[PDB]
Amino acid sequence: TLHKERRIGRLSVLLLLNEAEESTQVEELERDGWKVCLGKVGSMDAHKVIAAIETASKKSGVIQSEGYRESHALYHATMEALHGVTRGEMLLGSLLRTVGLRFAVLRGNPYESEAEGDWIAVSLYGTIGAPIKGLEHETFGVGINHI
Amino acid sequence: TLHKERRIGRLSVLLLLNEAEESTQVEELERDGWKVCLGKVGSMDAHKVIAAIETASKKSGVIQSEGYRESHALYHATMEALHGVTRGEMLLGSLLRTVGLRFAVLRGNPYESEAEGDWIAVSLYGTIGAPIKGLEHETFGVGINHI
């Protein structure tokens, strides 16, 4: 049973969609026990987007830089988040489209039971469109996995 | 070029991730020129989710009840939103899973140029999991289409 005050997806997105400067949200989340990561990436290569999120997450300590288990968890969460962004074909450049994304990676236990352990949410928000500036619309994606 | 203050996708999600009995968000969006629709639907059948959204959108005036054009725009936007929710296979019950969703449909021009016309954003947020309460996690979906 998800804890209303700990809905990892909702929190990662509210953080991702907030454009305030005086921004205590990251601090607030961390104070509540969440591991947080924020970044940006623009590319016509999906592998670069995956690479950016992975690197940023490991450098911020959201997931372990050693071992495979957590990288595996993150990879599949990223893949799922990319589904909402690509909608059908997980291809960007090869389908003549590119993305300008902001991404948030949030790690923690979103349930009332401590036995559920840590879960990770990968949220993406930005634009997807032609290689030409302006010709685009928004894109969104949230992937959640146990970790 | 997307108008910074009229990012329909971002606005539709934020509207959905809001939990203030007295937000006045809907009215505020309507006063800014947006046609807004909110609803909820729980089911193991994707077709019931699609139908709820279409019914709510037509009843609220978000899209014309007559003609195919707007219904077509909404259907595809709904399909794109379902991609983020289903991530790979647009199936619920047949894959032994179910959803509990809140949905928002916004309709207006998110671009700086009036020539871009109206666009529609279907946003979904809730849970997806086994038919058993508690065994589930969050799910998001955002589809954007022109009208």
Place this chain on the structure above:
Amino acid sequence: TLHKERRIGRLSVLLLLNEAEESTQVEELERDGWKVCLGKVGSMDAHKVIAAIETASKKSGVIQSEGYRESHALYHATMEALHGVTRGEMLLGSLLRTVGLRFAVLRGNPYESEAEGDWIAVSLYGTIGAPIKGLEHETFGVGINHI
């Protein structure tokens, strides 16, 4: 190398798209060695479409009624054709859509080399849309396989 005058795909589609009350196009195709099957099926169930095509193909003798080999070839060609019709998710009713289709199944050798043997083409044309009539547009699909 495809024989210019034996393009099984093109031929099956021309037959499918041309309303010839007279001048049996089927007779001409058969006179040239092609085995031909034509039919129509309307449904919100893809399995009924697949079934209609199989039954009609076997009844007309386009594929053997006994054995698996030929049914296997036909099934896959049918699946490939359905991809053009469904465009992403091979689902109809579960996604609140229905099809009204006319289908053609052609069998013969479309290559200059006789050693290539028989191939089969399954072609579909009609409409796909909401259950309510009027809300729909055209749909097409062609699947080709060796047999």
Place this chain on the structure above:
Amino acid sequence: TLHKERRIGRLSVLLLLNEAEESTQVEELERDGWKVCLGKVGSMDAHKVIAAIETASKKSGVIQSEGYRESHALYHATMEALHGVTRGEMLLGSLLRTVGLRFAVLRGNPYESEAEGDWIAVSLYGTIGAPIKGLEHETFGVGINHI
């Protein structure tokens, strides 16, 4: 309700499949109000196919060169057409296959109701096969969208 004499999909495919050295089928379509674009592209890169179609459609005036709305409509119709050609994975060269395509893009209102406005159809026909010539079969795809 689709106008029997204005089936944009069927018309785009007939144009595509019929080799008319004389009697300009294009002139007749244009005389009836349709905006038409024809072209050919051979490649192992789907983005070049998409690009060829967009450039040709804009050059011929089938869709506006400025703005995003119409390019958006065309892009999605192109994607839908590619589904019939690729049947599962919208990949060409990365899966060791290449296409030789002829394409047609038609724009007009295919419905009895003038209120429906313009719709667009992207149709593709040609071959798909191994890089080595001779090893290939036909491929088709039709995408329809409102614009």
Place this chain on the structure above:
Amino acid sequence: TLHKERRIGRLSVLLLLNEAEESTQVEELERDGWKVCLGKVGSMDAHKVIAAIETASKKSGVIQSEGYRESHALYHATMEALHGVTRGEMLLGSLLRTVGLRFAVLRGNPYESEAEGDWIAVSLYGTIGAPIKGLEHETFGVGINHI
């Protein structure tokens, strides 16, 4: 780094494909620390296949019957295993096909490092074909996930 003597996928499959009677393999695996589950399921409903594997796994203690975390791990492994079986469309009956499967669920650490924790492999083997006995060919699928 995978441990050659502990390759969870390979082991689950060798167990699944072994048709011996005097069968000490399950005992051998369990003696080595693996949690093992074996079953059979024939159906035209993918949800029944997923249901069978889940139930069998929980009744055999391969995964916890309480909580969501492990059910989540198993569900996604099952989904991945089903990809090899369905190859493109995770649909059975709706696409007029059915399966007769044997399944093995193996849980344990396949790496040299103990820090990798438990992983789960879901292996499927049997036939997939028409609803008629005989008209079918073999099908295989292996899904691996951390747990």
Place this chain on the structure above:
Amino acid sequence: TLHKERRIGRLSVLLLLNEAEESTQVEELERDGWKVCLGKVGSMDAHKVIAAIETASKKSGVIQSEGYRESHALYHATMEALHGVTRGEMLLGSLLRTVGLRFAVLRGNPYESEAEGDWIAVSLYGTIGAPIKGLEHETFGVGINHI
């Protein structure tokens, strides 16, 4: 009806999951009427995997080098096998992952009836993971097609 002692899929996997320097499995299979091919390939490009299999199959005599028919059968069998390996998106490098595979291709009649002709099974087994050694898990894929 599949011949219990000639289950091509099962035989191809078992052949691949074997690690005896002196198994004599290949010769034993060839003496039972099967055409056999074994190979290995590591890459971040699916097209290189497809090419290795095709090259190995033609060089070993598993399929004819001339004509398209057998190449077509093999290509689709290879594609079906890749589904189990890629599970959803038939992409490797573009999704920042790579494979280290062993493959086996068997060709013969697995049915009790000689009228079913020859069929081909492409089996894949190895690892899929990040471009970094150690960060990966097992992957399987089996594709079956008629010739």
